[PDB]
Scaffold this motif. Structure first.
Motif, PDB file in Angstrom:
ATOM      1  N   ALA A 250     -12.287  -3.490 -12.687  1.00  0.00           N
ATOM      2  CA  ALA A 250     -12.715  -2.636 -11.594  1.00  0.00           C
ATOM      3  C   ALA A 250     -11.860  -1.375 -11.558  1.00  0.00           C
ATOM      4  CB  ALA A 250     -12.623  -3.374 -10.259  1.00  0.00           C
ATOM      5  N   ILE A 251     -12.415  -0.323 -10.960  1.00  0.00           N
ATOM      6  CA  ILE A 251     -11.677   0.920 -10.772  1.00  0.00           C
ATOM      7  C   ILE A 251     -10.698   0.707  -9.623  1.00  0.00           C
ATOM      8  CG2 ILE A 251     -11.860   3.376 -10.175  1.00  0.00           C
ATOM      9  CD1 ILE A 251     -12.708   2.935 -12.935  1.00  0.00           C
ATOM     10  N   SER A 252      -9.557   0.093  -9.929  1.00  0.00           N
ATOM     11  CA  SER A 252      -8.513  -0.178  -8.951  1.00  0.00           C
ATOM     12  C   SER A 252      -7.447   0.905  -8.923  1.00  0.00           C
ATOM     13  CB  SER A 252      -7.865  -1.537  -9.236  1.00  0.00           C
ATOM     14  OG  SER A 252      -6.772  -1.773  -8.366  1.00  0.00           O
ATOM     15  N   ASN A 253      -7.698   2.033  -9.579  1.00  0.00           N
ATOM     16  CA  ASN A 253      -6.702   3.079  -9.752  1.00  0.00           C
ATOM     17  C   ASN A 253      -7.093   4.342  -8.991  1.00  0.00           C
ATOM     18  OD1 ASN A 253      -8.909   3.346 -11.393  1.00  0.00           O
ATOM     19  ND2 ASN A 253      -7.765   3.255 -13.322  1.00  0.00           N
ATOM     20  N   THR A 254      -7.486   4.169  -7.731  1.00  0.00           N
ATOM     21  CA  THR A 254      -7.801   5.259  -6.820  1.00  0.00           C
ATOM     22  C   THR A 254      -7.015   5.064  -5.529  1.00  0.00           C
ATOM     23  OG1 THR A 254      -9.804   4.021  -6.232  1.00  0.00           O
ATOM     24  CG2 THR A 254     -10.060   5.899  -7.723  1.00  0.00           C
ATOM     25  N   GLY A 255      -7.128   6.040  -4.625  1.00  0.00           N
ATOM     26  CA  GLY A 255      -6.468   5.943  -3.336  1.00  0.00           C
ATOM     27  C   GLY A 255      -7.098   4.936  -2.396  1.00  0.00           C
ATOM     28  N   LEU A 256      -8.386   4.637  -2.578  1.00  0.00           N
ATOM     29  CA  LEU A 256      -9.043   3.636  -1.743  1.00  0.00           C
ATOM     30  C   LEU A 256      -8.357   2.282  -1.864  1.00  0.00           C
ATOM     31  CD1 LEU A 256     -11.476   2.501  -0.038  1.00  0.00           C
ATOM     32  CD2 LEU A 256     -12.659   2.207  -2.228  1.00  0.00           C
ATOM     33  N   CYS A 257      -7.908   1.931  -3.072  1.00  0.00           N
ATOM     34  CA  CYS A 257      -7.332   0.615  -3.315  1.00  0.00           C
ATOM     35  C   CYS A 257      -5.907   0.479  -2.791  1.00  0.00           C
ATOM     36  CB  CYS A 257      -7.366   0.295  -4.810  1.00  0.00           C
ATOM     37  SG  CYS A 257      -9.028   0.283  -5.528  1.00  0.00           S
ATOM     38  N   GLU A 258      -5.228   1.587  -2.489  1.00  0.00           N
ATOM     39  CA  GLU A 258      -3.940   1.529  -1.808  1.00  0.00           C
ATOM     40  C   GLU A 258      -4.041   2.020  -0.368  1.00  0.00           C
ATOM     41  OE1 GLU A 258      -1.122   3.703  -4.082  1.00  0.00           O
ATOM     42  OE2 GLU A 258      -1.906   5.696  -3.606  1.00  0.00           O
ATOM     43  N   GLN A 259      -5.245   1.960   0.211  1.00  0.00           N
ATOM     44  CA  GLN A 259      -5.475   2.240   1.630  1.00  0.00           C
ATOM     45  C   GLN A 259      -5.031   3.653   2.001  1.00  0.00           C
ATOM     46  OE1 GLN A 259      -3.579  -1.210   1.268  1.00  0.00           O
ATOM     47  NE2 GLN A 259      -5.619  -1.585   0.402  1.00  0.00           N
ATOM     48  N   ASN A 260      -5.243   4.583   1.074  1.00  0.00           N
ATOM     49  CA  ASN A 260      -5.084   6.017   1.318  1.00  0.00           C
ATOM     50  C   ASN A 260      -6.277   6.719   0.680  1.00  0.00           C
ATOM     51  OD1 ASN A 260      -3.609   8.366   2.269  1.00  0.00           O
ATOM     52  ND2 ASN A 260      -3.036   8.747   0.130  1.00  0.00           N
ATOM     53  N   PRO A 261      -7.482   6.489   1.208  1.00  0.00           N
ATOM     54  CA  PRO A 261      -8.696   6.865   0.474  1.00  0.00           C
ATOM     55  C   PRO A 261      -9.155   8.299   0.690  1.00  0.00           C
ATOM     56  CG  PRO A 261      -9.310   5.705   2.447  1.00  0.00           C
ATOM     57  CD  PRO A 261      -7.800   5.716   2.425  1.00  0.00           C
ATOM     58  N   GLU A 262      -9.689   8.879  -0.384  1.00  0.00           N
ATOM     59  CA  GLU A 262     -10.427  10.139  -0.343  1.00  0.00           C
ATOM     60  C   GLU A 262     -11.907   9.774  -0.317  1.00  0.00           C
ATOM     61  OE1 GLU A 262     -11.072  11.838  -3.959  1.00  0.00           O
ATOM     62  OE2 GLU A 262     -11.478  13.895  -3.299  1.00  0.00           O
TER      63      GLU A 262
ATOM     64  N   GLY B 104       0.787  -1.215   0.000  1.00  0.00           N
ATOM     65  CA  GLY B 104       0.000   0.000   0.000  1.00  0.00           C
ATOM     66  C   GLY B 104       0.827   1.276   0.000  1.00  0.00           C
ATOM     67  N   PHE B 105       0.106   2.397  -0.095  1.00  0.00           N
ATOM     68  CA  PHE B 105       0.738   3.712  -0.201  1.00  0.00           C
ATOM     69  C   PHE B 105       1.650   3.989   0.990  1.00  0.00           C
ATOM     70  CE2 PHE B 105       1.043   8.241  -1.007  1.00  0.00           C
ATOM     71  CZ  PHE B 105       1.040   8.799   0.258  1.00  0.00           C
ATOM     72  N   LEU B 106       1.124   3.827   2.206  1.00  0.00           N
ATOM     73  CA  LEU B 106       1.931   4.025   3.406  1.00  0.00           C
ATOM     74  C   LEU B 106       2.879   2.863   3.656  1.00  0.00           C
ATOM     75  CD1 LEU B 106       2.067   6.327   5.419  1.00  0.00           C
ATOM     76  CD2 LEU B 106       0.858   4.895   7.043  1.00  0.00           C
ATOM     77  N   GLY B 107       2.424   1.636   3.399  1.00  0.00           N
ATOM     78  CA  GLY B 107       3.257   0.476   3.674  1.00  0.00           C
ATOM     79  C   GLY B 107       4.568   0.503   2.913  1.00  0.00           C
ATOM     80  N   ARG B 108       4.503   0.769   1.605  1.00  0.00           N
ATOM     81  CA  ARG B 108       5.713   0.762   0.788  1.00  0.00           C
ATOM     82  C   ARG B 108       6.684   1.861   1.203  1.00  0.00           C
ATOM     83  NH1 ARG B 108       2.436   3.888  -3.312  1.00  0.00           N
ATOM     84  NH2 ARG B 108       1.311   1.975  -3.888  1.00  0.00           N
ATOM     85  N   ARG B 109       6.175   2.972   1.738  1.00  0.00           N
ATOM     86  CA  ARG B 109       7.058   4.037   2.196  1.00  0.00           C
ATOM     87  C   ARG B 109       7.618   3.750   3.583  1.00  0.00           C
ATOM     88  NH1 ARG B 109       3.881   5.852  -1.612  1.00  0.00           N
ATOM     89  NH2 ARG B 109       4.415   7.710  -2.849  1.00  0.00           N
ATOM     90  N   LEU B 110       6.832   3.103   4.448  1.00  0.00           N
ATOM     91  CA  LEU B 110       7.335   2.717   5.762  1.00  0.00           C
ATOM     92  C   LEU B 110       8.477   1.717   5.642  1.00  0.00           C
ATOM     93  CD1 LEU B 110       4.191   2.321   8.078  1.00  0.00           C
ATOM     94  CD2 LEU B 110       5.971   4.078   8.167  1.00  0.00           C
ATOM     95  N   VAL B 111       8.345   0.751   4.729  1.00  0.00           N
ATOM     96  CA  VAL B 111       9.361  -0.288   4.574  1.00  0.00           C
ATOM     97  C   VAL B 111      10.694   0.323   4.159  1.00  0.00           C
ATOM     98  CG1 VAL B 111      10.010  -2.317   3.229  1.00  0.00           C
ATOM     99  CG2 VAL B 111       7.674  -2.092   4.105  1.00  0.00           C
ATOM    100  N   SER B 112      10.663   1.270   3.219  1.00  0.00           N
ATOM    101  CA  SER B 112      11.899   1.878   2.734  1.00  0.00           C
ATOM    102  C   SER B 112      12.600   2.668   3.831  1.00  0.00           C
ATOM    103  CB  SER B 112      11.599   2.777   1.534  1.00  0.00           C
ATOM    104  OG  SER B 112      12.758   3.474   1.113  1.00  0.00           O
TER     105      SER B 112
END
Lengths: 285, 286
Positions: free
Chosen positions: B61-73, A11-19
């Motif tokens: 699916a719309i997998s290209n948003t912040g929700l899918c990388e657990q940083n959601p708006e 994830g967004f935070l996970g990949r940055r925390l690991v580095s």
């Protein structure tokens, strides 16, 4: 050599925390295929084999239907996962750092920054499941630490990939000339990922409980994003104020962060946090 | 001379099984997220015109948003982005677009029995709301576009082709761990073997634009249906618990009336028969 097990490295935070934490810590960051969290037998034994001192859990505490082609949509508590991660952690007295969310506050009707002791009742599925994870991390792991995180961002010219967040959305409103919609009925903070990542070592020693964790903000979203857009040389008229959104009741998720300010953990406010790190960055613009 | 199909979501659950099915009969182009970015209007227009497919099957699916990388708006806005641009690209090359909708657009409905495509719907979750808005946008831009309302699906537990945990696998895990699989009498849902969804896909290409319920049928509740599915799989009957607490205010009825498509010669089996049919298909007799 302390061992840090990170669930959610993709994830967004996970990949940055690991580095960041791979500097002075051994970081074991498996994929959901490598480490099925709902396989209790596997997660207990793998946790014991790795024997981590600290567990930073960032993986999806359940999910909506989007991001998948064939989702179940049971819409039950769908907990587990962290429950098994929790019992595996308790077996070896690990220090668990849960990544929670300020969306737990999104049902509150009080005004101004909200503290961690105030009764909560979120309105969407994300806030509900995060709150439920918090409560159950507490009863099984009293020493565990819950950080209520905000919507976040990296610098929009960063090397580390990221999905569309607000700094990118404001730049896109500049190129496509279509205005970015927001509202005065929203009070929320956005925190540079670097402040979140740089303060993360200080949380290891915090006593167990729930901590607000991120930038502060006393301004509404429309006022906040104009100030940010105005920094990025984005036209003013490109940030619109839709009074229809959250018309029934404002979404106030701005956090009071004094609890972590007592323990020496500092976040700058949303506006001066963005500006300092827009300018500091080595991007010519 | 041989038709060409552009399939999005070529790696996902349905997308990968559509590509495999059609690769021998068509020229199937299944681009990855790197080959074709769905958040980029500019890029979508550029690639679809070059590929110039006669048929476009949008399963991704719309997998290209912040929700899918657990940083959601977490705005109420539920932006369409990718699906809207695909429609515009199709309008300019005159392509017959087939969209993967969902039966979850029926989960707010209070009516009883199988529901048809022409009723007034009001979904209560985020999946139903995104999917219904996708239909609304497509029928405006693309009158010829076809929207198939799918059900919750399943392959065989032992098929070498991967999937996430669906019904047939959860009932086996129940047997393994002796954990009761919980369901309810307050749910009316059908589930479809993916093979029936995929071998009928060629019939939909000729269908006149509009909405078509596309999946298996079910005339009884999840509890009774999951009990039937249990006994066929040889898993014990005690492991299907019906939690009547779930769906207390308004029972979830997403049973679909497929009466529209069977007039066009598209037949689906019902939930129980379709399962036994494939369950008997697997492992041929020695």
């Amino acid at each position: 050599m302390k061992t840090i097990l990170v669930t959610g490295g993709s994830g967004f935070l996970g990949r940055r925390l690991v580095s960041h934490l791979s500097k002075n810590y051994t970081v074991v960051a498996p994929t959901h295929g490598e480490l099925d969290l709902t396989d209790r037998e596997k997660i207990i034994s793998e946790v014991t084999k790795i024997n981590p001192q600290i567990i930073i859990h960032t993986a999806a505490i359940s999910n909506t239907g989007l991001c998948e082609q064939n989702p179940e949509l049971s819409e039950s508590i769908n907990l587990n996962g962290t429950k098994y991660l929790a019992e595996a952690a308790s077996k070896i007295n690990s220090k668990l750092i849960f990544c929670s969310s300020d969306q737990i506050y999104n049902g509150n009707a009080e005004k101004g920054p909200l503290s961690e002791d105030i009764d909560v009742h979120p309105v969407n599925v994300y806030g509900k499941h995060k709150l439920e994870a918090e409560r159950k991390l507490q009863e099984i792991l009293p020493t565990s630490v819950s950080l209520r995180l905000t919507w976040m961002y990296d610098h929009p010219s960063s090397k580390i990939p990221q999905h569309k967040n607000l700094p990118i959305m404001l730049l896109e409103a500049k190129e496509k000339n279509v205005p970015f919609v927001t509202t005065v009925n929203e009070y929320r903070a956005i925190t540079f990922v670097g402040e979140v990542v740089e303060n993360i070592e200080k949380t290891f020693e915090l006593p167990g409980g729930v901590y607000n964790y991120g930038a502060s903000n006393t301004s509404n979203s429309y006022e906040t994003y104009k100030e940010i857009a105005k920094i990025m040389d984005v036209p003013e008229n490109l940030v619109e104020n839709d009074t229809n959104r959250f018309k029934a009741q404002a979404r106030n998720i701005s956090m009071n962060i004094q609890k972590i300010e007592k323990h020496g953990i500092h976040f700058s406010n949303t506006v001066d946090g963005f500006s300092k790190m827009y300018k500091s960055f080595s991007n010519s613009e």
